[PDB]
Design a protein around this nucleic acid. Sequence first.
RNA 1: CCCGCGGUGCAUUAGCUAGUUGGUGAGGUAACGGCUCACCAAGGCCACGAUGCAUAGCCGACCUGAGAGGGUGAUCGGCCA
RNA 2: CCCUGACGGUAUCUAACCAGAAAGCCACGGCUAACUACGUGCCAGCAGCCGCGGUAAUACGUAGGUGGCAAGCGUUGUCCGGAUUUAUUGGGCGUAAAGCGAGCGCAGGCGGUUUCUUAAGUCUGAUGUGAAAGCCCCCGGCUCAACCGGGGAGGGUCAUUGG
Lengths: 163, 201, 89, 83, 131, 136
Amino acid sequence: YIDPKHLELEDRVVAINRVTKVVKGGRRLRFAALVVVGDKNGHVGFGTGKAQEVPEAIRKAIEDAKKNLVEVPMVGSTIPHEVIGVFGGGRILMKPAVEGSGVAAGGPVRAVLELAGVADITSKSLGSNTPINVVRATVEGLKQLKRAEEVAALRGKSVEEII
Amino acid sequence: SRYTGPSWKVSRRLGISLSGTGKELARRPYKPGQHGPNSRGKVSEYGMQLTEKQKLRHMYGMNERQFRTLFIKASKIKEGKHGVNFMVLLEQRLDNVVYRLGLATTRRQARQLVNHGHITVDGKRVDIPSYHVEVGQVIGVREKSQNISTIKEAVEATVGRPAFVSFDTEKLEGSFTRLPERDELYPEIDEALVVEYYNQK
Amino acid sequence: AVKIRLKRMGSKKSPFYRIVVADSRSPRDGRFIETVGTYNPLKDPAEVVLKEDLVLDWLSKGAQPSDTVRNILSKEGVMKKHHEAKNVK
Amino acid sequence: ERNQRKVYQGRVVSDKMDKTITVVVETKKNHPIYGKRMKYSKKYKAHDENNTAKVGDIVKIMETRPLSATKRFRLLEVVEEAV
Amino acid sequence: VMTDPIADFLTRIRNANMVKHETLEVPASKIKRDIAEILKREGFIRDVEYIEDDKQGVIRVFLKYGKNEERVITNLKRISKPGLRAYVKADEVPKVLNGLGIAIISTSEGVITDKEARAKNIGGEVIAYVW
Amino acid sequence: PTINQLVRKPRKSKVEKSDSPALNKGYNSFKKTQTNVNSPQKRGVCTRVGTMTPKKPNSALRKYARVRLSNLIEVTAYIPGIGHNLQEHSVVLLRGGRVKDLPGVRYHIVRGALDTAGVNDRKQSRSKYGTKRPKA
RNA sequence: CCCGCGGUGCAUUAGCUAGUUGGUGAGGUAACGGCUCACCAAGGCCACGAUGCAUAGCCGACCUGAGAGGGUGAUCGGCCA
RNA sequence: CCCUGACGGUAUCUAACCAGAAAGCCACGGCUAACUACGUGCCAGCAGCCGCGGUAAUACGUAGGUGGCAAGCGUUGUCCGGAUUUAUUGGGCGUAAAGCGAGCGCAGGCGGUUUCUUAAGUCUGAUGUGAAAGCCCCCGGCUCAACCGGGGAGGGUCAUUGG
């Protein structure tokens, strides 16, 4: 559902891009921005927007980025289990880590992971490294994380019966 | 080698005091050189991890090989975290013991006092500053010739005596009561940026 | 010609020795049959550790000590026991 | 004689020589890199006091000592005859 | 020609699960009945009923869905294959999905779950992962 | 592949090759030339000197030499820095390093190591170019 | 001294063997044995890679890698020549 | 009881005197931490890959400053990683590289349901062995550390025998 944008959020630039469009005569140029948004507590969204200058671009992107947000469960500063997120040529593997190990993750994925309050996790990109598709694949892989309570509820069991 | 330079340019480059809050960053809190007051654009996330590592390396005045071996040694504990155990092993070296106890103002002075052979652990002299002081070992001041000018005066003016340090100002014996904690130790710089800096070394 | 002799294991000027039973043709630090105790020339009253239940078994099979091994095997009372088992029955 | 030799099993393959027969003992073993199991064969020569056993028989043999340039086994017994 | 009936069973379950309807039928077998009971005990299936007329079959499975029609089994995988078989030792028994999923192992004393095997300390052929 | 195809015929990888191949040499004295003896440098005698013009779009006259090596195979080599003292039949030392000016050159001579001489103005990276420390 | 199993490239290298494979006896050796003799027979090995050509002392170990692996066999110990 | 040291008057310990004898190499356009002057003008030169140099060059050469390491600092050569770029772990074949022009078939690879049996694969227990030194875990000695010593684990696709 909508996690509504009413929190304390620390944004971050992940990329910018000089992008043209050839017209009669010469050339036009815009700037596209990629931004992440979160509160370092388990709510993270991404969003992009373009404008004619860099501040206006990053602004429209934070506008967009706040409209989407994901819940990102965790069990004590570490993801519940192992997931693989795939979105269009970007494949990203994520594993649970050891207490106080840090985040070993590449450029785009570490921004996403740090602004959700993840502390100890290992990653690897077995795919392409275009920033947009890496971010989208990472968020695609968090959405597969299952809480321990929900599984016990769906089946006819209790917890401490399946762990 | 150790280091002998102006020692104050160093603090202006890290943005941290490094000398017991006695202000090197009083006037001109910016960096040295021509392009000091005229700062420039952003710093990478490599510059940040490097700056944290350099802050910690210059705090206790050691070299890069020894810093890295101490870090590799702290990684074999697996009781707690890996940055906390590091910054705690860093504190148990005989130079910090003389600094904390209060027999010296700076850490350079404490280093020269332990190098020139003026202190003793358990009665026996020990001369090398990277020594590893364990918990519960009364380090003393060479009861042969403890009548020196600077040691005497720097015992009087106690700017900082901690909550893990024990001491008596008559026999001049000190010791650690127990191991410190991060709340009790510079909760200002880091121990996570430094751990990440060594992941890709 | 099985022997019971010393084998050097120090660094350069701090020697240490293992007490070992070896064929006499072997190199001093080469191959051996088994190890029987330890001996430390520093440590002013020198330190000897040894099993003394394999020494008595090798001695009765014809092994022979070197001169220093015999000294430190009599300070332990192993030669007297050999004496009291062989020529007494 | 408290120590024991090696006995095997196989199907006779050649019986042309006088007093000597080739026995193939067969087994499966795995691949070092990949997993699956391949079958493997090696031939043995064994001694025959009277040129008895024939092809298709399922025999047992036992290890002896050098009896020739190649033969190291003797014929224990015939378990199951071909027809 | 059919060469892996266990894989065919698993793919029927997954195919009928993804299109989200509530029944399924297969030709019966002693191993498929075993894993249908194991699937029923843990909470993935709702029921299983056994008809049998004049050939092997059949076995009817009744799938199970959440409160908002979401799915309780999310995928299903065949591990040992005819062509590369996978045997596991008592200390190699796997833990699928950090305990939130199950593995199915055939041992000298039944076709059992992976908990029941690392409680007995044995191993065997690995049939499937269902998480 | 199926794992049966793999078992019938395994996987084979590609073979890598140096870009300084005249530095794994062997003598031509008694019998023939031996390839085991990877060297960091080789020496030789320069059989010519001079200049040549670079590729597109650079523009210069870049100094070079041709050198015969102890193992008797011939290569050309760039001489760097500003100003040298190399003439016909002077003995020199080569290291690896390929220039991107023209084809056929894959080596550098090292300044101040044999008959060749260090450059005589440098003040800033004298460890290359073989200049000694001046009192200035 | 004999045996099981294990570690390299080439199929733009498919046929190799005539004391060769087995039997009888005789000599010979610490010792069994084509080990060597005389006679009798026509056998032996190979696509699960024989034969040939090229390269190489083998191992405990050492470097690197999350692991599975990959690359080396210098100081020190063992076996060989 | 008595008798023997090449190293060697070596390590070491005590007294006096003096800040006096003891800092260099690489880099600073992006990757990748660290910028301004002057000289020169597609020249002289630089480059690991992008690429610099034709009058105001943070990319050439000097000076001032700054960054990294430090009794060392850079360069070349060789090997593993990054390289899922030979993919068992762990990739692919409509148009990017890649389905033989098609069939028939010896050897091989893989095979429907079920009752009893066997024990070759598979799983499991006990015993023997896998030297010493190494890596690793605990403990101890050299003022510390490198280093040295004591006790352990580990390493087989191994053998024998019982389920």
